[PDB]
Structure 1
Amino acid sequence: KVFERCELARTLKRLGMDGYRGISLANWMCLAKWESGYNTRATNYNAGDRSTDYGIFQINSRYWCNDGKTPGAVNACHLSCSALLQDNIADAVACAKRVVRDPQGIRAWRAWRNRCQNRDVRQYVQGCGV
């Protein structure tokens, strides 16, 4: 499904994302915005290393979820990459939380650095009631 902005913000808040490991809701919104445009169905194949990015946060198969076809891959979130394609984002959120429990935190996503880091991200949550 393709979430509407404020709908996603309240959904993420309800799932305990606001301030998770010091990361604000607006940052998660900015990440979801640039990674998939709030699309839970989004998939991006990386011909370069035979891995695939899944769901609203575009989590990679080489390290986080198992899709069985990625060479030399691990499954740190301990989920099928299929769980990262559901309309219900609870599993995707549990996995995003796992990603940020590592040293880099939100910096694990290259796009967050390019599109969200050191930027005014207030607009992502304005008017949403979060």
Structure 2
Amino acid sequence: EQLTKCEVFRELKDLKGYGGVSLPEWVCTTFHTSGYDTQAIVQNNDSTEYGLFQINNKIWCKDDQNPHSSNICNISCDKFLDDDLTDDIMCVKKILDKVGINYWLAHKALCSEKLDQWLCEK
């Protein structure tokens, strides 16, 4: 499910300013993390990342590949592949509170400058 820039802008409302991260920074971070695809699945080494935010199953959510996950978000990873981003966002908040925005390697590298390009109107 490939969302558009403004659909992401609209759906990530509850993250606005959280942890001091602006909405524009989030639209930018999710693109360079999953390309706006809520069904994105990437697995490198002993880890598989899920959804729009690419939440790993190493410590955030539990899945099949790793039953022994810390599962800090207390949720099955498959819940990060549907169209409802509510539970994804709740988990993102736990990630921000704990490891911070740097979980998303893309934020520092490309989403800390030039943010106006990522805004929407109306």
Q: Is TM (by shorter chain) over 0.5? A: yes
Q: CA deviation at 1:65?
A: 0.6
Q: CA RMSD in A?
A: 1.5
8 Å contact from structure 1 (residues 62, 71) kept in 2? no
8 Å contact from structure 1 (residues 9, 29) kept in 2? yes
- Corresponding position of 1:6: 6
Residues 31-74 of structure 1 deviation map (CA, whole Å, 9 limit, x = unaligned) = 1110011110000011x2x1101000111110111113227531
- Corresponding position of 1:110: 105
- Kindly indicate which of the two structures has a greater share of residues assigned to helix: 2
Runs of 4 or more, structure 1, over 2 Å off, are: 70-73
State yes or no: 1:19 paired with 2:17: yes
- Corresponding position of 1:122: 116
- TM-score, structure 2 as length reference: 0.91
- Corresponding position of 2:76: 80
State yes or no: 1:43 paired with 2:38: no
Percent identity (aligned): 37
Partners of 2:117 and 2:56 lie apart in 1 by 27
- TM-score, structure 1 as length reference: 0.86
Query: What 5-or-longer segments of structure 1 have no aligned partner?
Result: none
Partners of 2:47 and 2:102 lie apart in 1 by 19
Aligned residues: 122
